[PDB]
Write an enzyme that holds these catalytic residues in place. Structure first.
Site, short mmCIF file in Angstrom:
data_model
loop_
_atom_site.label_atom_id
_atom_site.label_comp_id
_atom_site.label_asym_id
_atom_site.label_seq_id
_atom_site.Cartn_x
_atom_site.Cartn_y
_atom_site.Cartn_z
N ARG A 107 -2.07 -1.86 -6.74
CA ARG A 107 -1.99 -3.03 -5.89
C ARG A 107 -2.70 -4.24 -6.51
NH1 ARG A 107 -1.14 -5.04 -0.33
NH2 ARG A 107 -3.22 -5.53 0.50
N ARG A 120 0.85 -1.20 0.00
CA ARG A 120 0.00 0.00 0.00
C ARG A 120 0.89 1.24 0.00
NH1 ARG A 120 -2.14 -3.45 3.77
NH2 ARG A 120 -4.18 -4.29 3.13
N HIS A 146 -2.20 -10.99 2.37
CA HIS A 146 -3.59 -11.37 2.57
C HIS A 146 -3.71 -12.73 3.18
CE1 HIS A 146 -4.82 -8.58 -0.95
NE2 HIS A 146 -5.10 -8.00 0.20
N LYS A 180 -1.53 -0.83 8.15
CA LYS A 180 -2.94 -1.12 8.23
C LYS A 180 -3.31 -2.46 8.84
CE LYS A 180 -7.16 -1.28 5.54
NZ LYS A 180 -7.83 -1.62 4.25
N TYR A 232 -8.55 -8.87 -4.90
CA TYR A 232 -7.53 -8.10 -5.59
C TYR A 232 -7.30 -8.75 -6.95
CZ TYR A 232 -6.49 -4.76 -2.00
OH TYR A 232 -6.68 -3.72 -1.12
N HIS A 237 -3.86 3.49 -5.47
CA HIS A 237 -4.08 2.21 -4.83
C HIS A 237 -4.27 1.08 -5.82
CE1 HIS A 237 -4.90 0.07 -1.10
NE2 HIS A 237 -5.81 -0.63 -1.76
#
Lengths: 283, 273, 283, 273
Positions: free
Chosen positions: A238, A139, A260, A162, A269, A235
């Site tokens: 990503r 990110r 993830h 995050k 994603y 973003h």
DNA sequence: TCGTTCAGCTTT
DNA sequence: TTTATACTAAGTTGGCATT
DNA sequence: TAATGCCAACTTAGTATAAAAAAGCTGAACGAG
DNA sequence: TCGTTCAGCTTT
DNA sequence: TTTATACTAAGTTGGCATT
DNA sequence: TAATGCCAACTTAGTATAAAAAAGCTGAACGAG
């Protein structure tokens, strides 16, 4: 008690949840909205209908996202009022969270190349920020905080702000589709940028992730490309990263690289949301 | 009937519960906080509003940990009351539990060494205890009761008081980072300390765990070190132990030595596979 | 409506949950108890106190297990009455599930050897059943249903009846501590027993798992051993297996062999519940 | 106001919802079941008891699947009513959803072959469809709309009607277990079928998906096969396809071909490690 | 004795 | 099957007390 | 004295459970030998 | 222009 | 972070209808 | 005729979300050049 008085109390509770600054800022903004939207009357007397009216107000201006969060915050606030013995039932729970689909468009490799090129007259760090992002899948917030000191023995160490996820990325990555070499890229960042942070300003200082995102957006406009609905943002590099690595290496790699743990997030994603035709390989 | 007349009945119930003395004592204290925190009104009239009011009183003083335990107990006593139908509803249930992050700070090997140094003004048993506590990784209460007879053919037998876990620790362990030999540490104990328990007071008798702890705390202050959050305590020597052994030998080993019936108490290398 | 009338209806609901026969039998038995225990009065009027009185009745006879299940069944029955609009609140939820610790004693390797020996005058299959169990860690129900046809290329294929878990066990296992060889054992079962099921009766027929468990119990009594609380049962050969393999091979092996996806379950079979002193190895 | 006066208002809401025609039609039907299942009483007077009574009526007839969907809709219409405050509580919420196991039976390669054989009395397109359905693994609705122009430089482009998934299938695939060549199957299509769509009616025009399905069903009966639970349907050729490709090539591949945005739709070898 | 099913309990 | 919570049983330490 | 305990009010930390489903345990009574 | 923070929104 | 549930958008097929 | 559609009432099957927390996006207004 009274709504606005309870919201005053409610803030304090949040100040004690141990949530991060950004999270508190987000909540505060939802309450401020709740204050303008609803009267300062006894909690027990605030009707589902009134709550419904406001949310629909936001939904009608096309702020479904805002509606859904506001509804959440109010709800939780009622759960706390209930937990402190003021109310006794959650008049929000009966409501239905506004349904909204993501408006932001995904980014295709070609589009990335046009933008990358359009970012010619942009500060030297942009292109670099861009390459480092797609080749690492991190990110932007984490991107702009990477320090040269996090690289030890060919591996870049990342602790996602995050999520807390920790990963060691091998500096040996490559995005064949875009002709991007992580190592080559880190080398251009070392000379051309030279700073404690791998990404740095022209004055060799760290940048705010909002700025990097801001310049990408400009380069994007500078590209002259058109999109359905909302434009791709920084973003989006990503998912691009995830989708590209998906076809080049493997699902799991893409999944580990982006940090993830879950599959709900990974398969997300991995989705291009109709941007292109998925040419199925016999692999 | 009434909250206090009930707290009275409630106590006698707990007494029959079959728990350890310390647990029961823990309970009694929570009850007293309740006694001084709520009116002696009819159970039926005690509001969630009131309860929260008390529970927040503690939270506000930063005693979140206590707020949680008092709440927990309160609810238990109310449930028992509903069983006997003195009430129909448990008004504590609607209340939420105060979540609290542990503030106690960890102990690093450098600090241990530094603390061990300030220990010089302390009895000789303080040092041996510290050393023994890091090399064997046992709870202070269990350390204080180890007797020389619990050692057989190279093994120190321990039946942990808190959980009943039974273990046989090999008297050959050795903490590398701090240069501690369980064999040498035990030896110093027998020659210097003299008594039936491995650790022992000057009066050559068993020491209270509250003391070992208290004297370590003295040394900690005496060392002048500074930490974030609350200062590390004697119990932290057990975590330093776990962490050290974790690397030296194995994570699996750290677990068995501390004796956790679970695995409940990082960096992912990404392979281009 | 009325309790006994609702319990009549409740059974039908269960008959539609798609639960297995044994599960339904267990539930039926709890209802039968609920029928003797509680009056045939309007559901709305059955008091927590009355429910409490019964459960305490069972608890006082030392049937805490029974209490806890009965309480569960009643509770669920109320949740269904609530789901069909008869009641509106669960008068059981306010109750506290009786707390009870497992009375059954674990089994140590030595004890296993004494029993194994005591099972001399027992039908030839017992010893075999015993060895196969500890060396495989499978439940007795699955044990008695294994067919020679489930062995393909050195691997014994098991689909656990209770969980659905599927595993292929290599016939190359060995319990060094008890001097048990899976392969040697399967060979004695092939000649000495010869049946379609790996474990078979003297008439070459499959046995009921209850019988195997029954004979183990006798051999146990025949051993003259004493235990605190309740005696070990056949099932205990499963934890023994887990604990033995734990120290011989590894935690994970023990965990995979027994078919435990979870760690809550694995760390539980791994516990000896104070039977012995755990000699810590520097591994 | 009243249940039916509301179901009336509720419909118009759904109409503005922005969903596909079929979905909306699915909804309308659920509404009608409700119309014939509940009184036209004031929303406020409609009981959980009543609702369950209706929902069980379906369950009893074994129409559990329908009970679930009707319940689902009912609750949605009640929520909308609470938004407009015609009620305060959603009495459907307390009701539980009927869980139902799918009874439709799978199709094995031997059965497919057997069915393919009975297809001989069927139009020539039935066979080509079947073959095409197993080799490309696409939904019947998507098959019926494939046009010859969707094929480019060795790829069949498909934008799945149900989910919007866009894929490019390589015209070189081949199902080993059944000896099917997507290249040969497509070729037979162009010479025998004649029309702008790959699959086509005798009248050389696009076929309805309801038809392909219906004619496969005929063959199934005509084959005399027997199954457990309900008989396999045309849609099962898609699962046979998934399963076959699963082994031949890879599980990963089976997923991308069917085009699932997830991985949501066994034997653990124990190593002595 | 070798073996099985029914029941009311306890474990997983 | 597993994560949050309820029970249990410590450990920490300032004050005042025992030896 | 110093060295140590004990009370009390707090903060930590080890385990067992929840929910439902599905076993497993073993006294009895019964069946063929 | 290069860059940063505040706000009200949208995403993850 | 993940499992159950709510939304969506099919697919299945008996009857009756269109071509 | 046959070959095919269409309605209707059912059964299946693909995706997005829940909860909370913590980002990310980018118009403005502002600061040093």
């Amino acid at each position: 008690m009274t709504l606005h008085s309870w919201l005053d109390r409610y803030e304090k509770i949040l100040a004690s949840r141990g949530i991060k600054q950004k999270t508190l800022i987000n909540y505060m903004s939802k309450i401020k909205a709740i204050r303008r939207g609803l009267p300062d009357a006894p909690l027990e007397d605030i009707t589902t209908k009134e709550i419904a009216a406001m949310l629909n107000g936001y939904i009608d201006e096309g702020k479904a996202a805002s509606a859904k969060l506001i509804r959440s915050t109010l709800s939780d606030a009622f759960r706390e009022a209930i937990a402190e013995g003021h109310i006794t039932t959650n008049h929000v729970a009966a409501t239905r969270a506004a349904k909204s689909k993501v408006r932001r468009s995904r980014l295709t490799a070609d589009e990335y190349l046009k933008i990358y090129q359009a970012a010619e007259s942009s500060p030297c760090w942009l292109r670099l920020a861009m390459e480092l992002a797609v080749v690492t899948g991190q990110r932007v917030g984490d991107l702009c905080e990477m320090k040269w000191s996090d690289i030890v023995d060919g591996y870049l160490y990342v602790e996602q702000s995050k999520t807390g996820v920790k990963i060691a990325i091998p500096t040996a990555l490559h995005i064949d589709a875009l002709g991007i070499s992580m190592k080559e890229t880190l080398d251009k960042c070392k000379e051309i940028l030279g700073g404690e942070t791998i990404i740095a300003s022209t004055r060799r200082e760290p940048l705010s992730s909002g700025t990097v995102s801001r310049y990408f957006m400009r380069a994007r406009k500078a590209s002259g490309l058109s999109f359905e609905g909302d434009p791709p943002t920084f973003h989006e590099l990503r998912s691009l990263s995830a989708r590209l690595y998906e076809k080049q290496i493997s699902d799991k790699f893409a999944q580990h690289l982006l940090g993830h743990k879950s599959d709900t997030m990974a398969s997300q994603y991995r989705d291009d949301r109709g941007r292109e035709w998925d040419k199925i390989e016999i692999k």
